[PDB]
Design an enzyme around this catalytic site. Structure first.
Site, short mmCIF file in Angstrom:
data_model
loop_
_atom_site.label_atom_id
_atom_site.label_comp_id
_atom_site.label_asym_id
_atom_site.label_seq_id
_atom_site.Cartn_x
_atom_site.Cartn_y
_atom_site.Cartn_z
N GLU C 179 0.88 -1.17 0.00
CA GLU C 179 0.00 0.00 0.00
C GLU C 179 0.92 1.22 0.00
OE1 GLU C 179 -0.18 1.63 3.57
OE2 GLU C 179 1.59 0.44 3.06
N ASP C 204 -7.40 -7.23 -4.41
CA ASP C 204 -6.72 -7.64 -5.62
C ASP C 204 -5.43 -8.34 -5.23
OD1 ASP C 204 -8.01 -4.69 -6.36
OD2 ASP C 204 -8.29 -6.14 -7.98
#
Lengths: 233, 233, 233, 233, 233, 233
Positions: C179, C204
């Site tokens: 992230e 995902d």
């Protein structure tokens, strides 16, 4: 369409103004454009398309910091076919050569980010704008009676800096102000063979601690808006 | 007077042309300047003062590499009161956007040197020229019918590169050519509040291997000398 | 009170949920809390206060990237007296130890950013959450029947990576997902002596290329919200 | 033959004495060599071939800074078949262990340049001379009654340093003096399997600000020239 | 008297042999020292004082790794007034210039460690031995009829290397073998103004893939122990 | 069967306790384990196997420094199939949050080493323990009435530090204490997919300047050894 923009293909004109603040972009569309249309709103990051003196202009917010700006600029170029990116915004001045209400044209963006080292062989990438856009800014300013203050900005990962003691050294090497995205906008445009420029309005002076009133901030920014819209038409 | 320049104080005009090769400097003084005089010759690094269009113009050689350049322009600015520095020379093209005989205006100079990290807090200094000089260059080129190519160069500490595999990436990020001093010239003039610009003549394409003939090299360099002297006069 | 938050003094509860996307913040307020009130909206970055099981809880958007997150978290703590900050979001899994709909607890956040080197002596800062908060997340996850994946994340300055060849090496060293803010959240909380944790919902998988349908993402995020509000109650 | 050297193949003897200043190379030729012949003069950078006590020896200038030195040494080794490169020159002393007129043997060359991290995997390369050469120097110094100071030298990219406060710490770590090329000489010879050594003469002490006179400077350099010519014949 | 050595003041001789292996140290005490006594043993790291052919001589273990070797070397110099330190051990050959049972004298130790950058202004410290020791090791090995190989070693923080692909490059730059302490030994002796050297026995060749038989091992070693002890008396 | 461990495969149990001082693992073997047995003694680095309340437990020493710890942890995991590794030792406290006799669980290990940059793409690897070991440690200590202090340690290559002025900033970023191995243990175990955790007892305090008397040492260490054996049983 992209993870961060839900505009239809072709919704953007090839010339796009950028601000960190999507509410500023909304301000511009409402007050300055004809037939303005909101074309994207993912994460509340608004974008618009409309007309200035019969010429299509798009507007996009890009959030704060190099990493946020790089995301939006990458998508605008690669997916929405944007060709010229003009970023306007405020910046905190750090040099005695500029004062409140000056407009700075950033012909270079130094940085404490590691992003350009990651992009560029762990060497020093000199992040610079497109010269033709710079020239057009200069000619448009001169014709509008604006005296552009021209030099580097320093693009920092930090709003609340841990190196304020370094501002004098920055100014000594011709950094006129600090902001947080120009080094990323420029590197991304260089990567993707696009034309970019950053113009910054001085609303706060970080050395003298002078600052514009709320009313002087809107009129100051309005003068930079008109510079931007006139150089794109 | 300085350890590397034996000119009298006041021998240099405030505008100075620079080349790495002092024999090129000598060639300019003989062929292009009026009433030129040799003003320095320490370490065989020649410098001259003469007149062009009735106007005082100085020339100085600076040798090869950022470290050598930095020595000479620090002294010109701090001891000899030089205010404007225009560097001309040849550069190896790496981009498809430029070809033989093109003149490049370097609006940024990236580098693999550590010198700017040492200068600038270990961050990324975007080494850039003075915008007023670059505007003068562009306008003079235009008057002379010169199609000026404008972009970054890459200033390397290596003539014989160990990173040839990276020229394509450099070109992608709008580096038009490679040379060995611009980043130091720009950083030093930034440090010392002086105006500097680098112009680069394409005599060899490092990717496509094409090259100018010996006569085409003389002509190409002459075209750049005229550009330089006209923008300073 | 701050340049980026216009909440009144005392508007924030000392426990705050964070998401990059202000519109998810807004969704949580409208669906999961009672008596929810918008307390700030500078730059369209919305923040809320409300009640969960009658206990006060606040919510704040922090935008994308370490630089943006750091701004909002710094301000929340220093000005608004927030003491506990729990970041929930989606992430891109890179390890075969996790799959779609999994919730990851980031006990560490590696990064390619330079911000922690700048913060911390140019050494390696191991950015980590508050243990007690992570203990609390684990206990709440068990009593909720959630199978919490636990490991490091990698916080990148790049959504569009230039080092996708490196995802396997990252996964090897127990990075479960990628992230873009955790390392900034963690370092800021360490600087300012506050308690932070990042929770991570896999929507995902960047290696297997599997992805959730829009309906499934709603369901997967709703469960992470529940875990977050439960561990705050 | 090479872009920077004018000589025909076989003009250079396999052993070669080097200085930055081509006019010192010229002085050595005229005053100390029989049958001396100027063999290269590109960019006014002079080189010679002659004889000292029947031994054929070559002389070559290399300009200032690692980058310039690296160019010339690379071409001497790879084109002109030079096997032994002995560099003499002056150096500013920073160590209390040395004083005016001392001759220093550089058994290591530290640097602030990035060139060796570029060459050597971004690790620390210990640039060092060839031991057999350093033995001949020691043995020849003794035969001539020269008190040879032996230690490290610091090769800077800066003649005008930005870290003069650091000179004490350098001396502490057994750097006797500062010059600007030994680190590149040594690393180039290591890359190209050649034998190199640097000797330098103290005519100025940077810390005590003692200097020799325009009289003992000449005789100091002669003493070193004789040492160098001797240890090579 | 130190946190790592429990010897008494005066109990060390000013000449000391070191190995990473304390059990190899005892082997030197038992099989080579007259009047041999164990003088320290904290953390089972053994040291000895005795006499070799009528000259007093100390032996000390220093463990594995630069940081470990730095601890012992620092205390030996600062507290026990050691003045000469000679390090012996084996080392994986990586150069085709060395074969089995060659003894390597390390005139420079390069490293992938960050310790010297922390010591030395984030620049490149050229970690070198004391010259007159290396001259002694050279003379001693010659009339002892040892063909001493002289060059660099590479000191790694990694026994199990993650950069095996790089040994060829190291070999190109005159790195004959790899070990794990010499860079820290040499830097610590430079910091504290003592005299150090490191010798190296090739028992394994990492490129070629030979290995000595267990018979040939503490057979090749003893020839270097003898070399060491001979150059201290 | 490895260059640094003597034991036969099968001598080590899957769960293993680690100390730097091999005399300390011997202490633990004789006092706390029944059927104690020494299984390796290469380089005098001792390891042991025995039982504690029924379950088999191994002990191994690893020396000082990240490089040394890494050799042992690697050989343990890769050759001898160790799968849990619990490190206990003493640490110098640097934070006001801990006083003497406290037990510190290191949930992250910062470092001035380059080793994790070499392992992890020159980025910032956040070295962290396995979360389940740390959850075991906390549940156990709570059952044994021990007040566990949790946060980062700082793993340094320097016992005798050159950056003592920085301890305040370390403690500000939640670094409770300094040692020399934890980041290397944590990263080796991440690399090799094993469970690792570090605990250390505060016998001294580097900022306030306390210590424990020779026998307050032995007893506080015992409270840690019992924590360790309980959580592996």
């Amino acid at each position: 369409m992209t993870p961060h923009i839900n505009a239809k293909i072709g919704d953007f004109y090839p010339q796009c103004l950028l601000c960190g603040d999507p509410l500023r972009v909304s301000y511009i569309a409402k007050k300055f454009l004809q037939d303005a249309k909101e074309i994207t709103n993912v994460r509340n990051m608004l974008g618009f398309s409309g007309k200035y003196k019969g010429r299509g202009i798009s507007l996009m917010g890009h959030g704060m910091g190099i990493a946020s700006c790089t995301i939006y600029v990458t998508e605008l170029i690669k997916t929405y076919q944007v060709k010229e990116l003009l970023r306007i915004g405020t910046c905190g001045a750090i040099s005695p050569k500029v004062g409140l209400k000056d407009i700075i044209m950033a012909t270079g963006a130094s940085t404490d980010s590691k992003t350009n080292r990651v992009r560029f062989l762990n060497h020093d990438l000199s992040a610079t704008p497109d010269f033709e856009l710079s020239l057009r800014a200069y000619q448009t300013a001169k014709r509008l009676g604006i005296d552009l203050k021209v030099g580097n900005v320093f693009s920092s990962d930090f709003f609340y800096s841990f190196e304020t003691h370094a501002f004098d050294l920055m100014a000594k090497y011709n950094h006129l102000a600090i902001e947080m995205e120009a080094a990323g906008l420029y590197a991304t445009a260089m990567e993707l063979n696009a034309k970019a420029l950053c113009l910054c309005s001085v609303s706060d002076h970080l050395i003298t601690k002078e600052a514009l009133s709320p009313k002087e901030r809107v009129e100051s920014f309005d003068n930079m808006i008109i510079l931007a819209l006139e150089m794109m038409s």
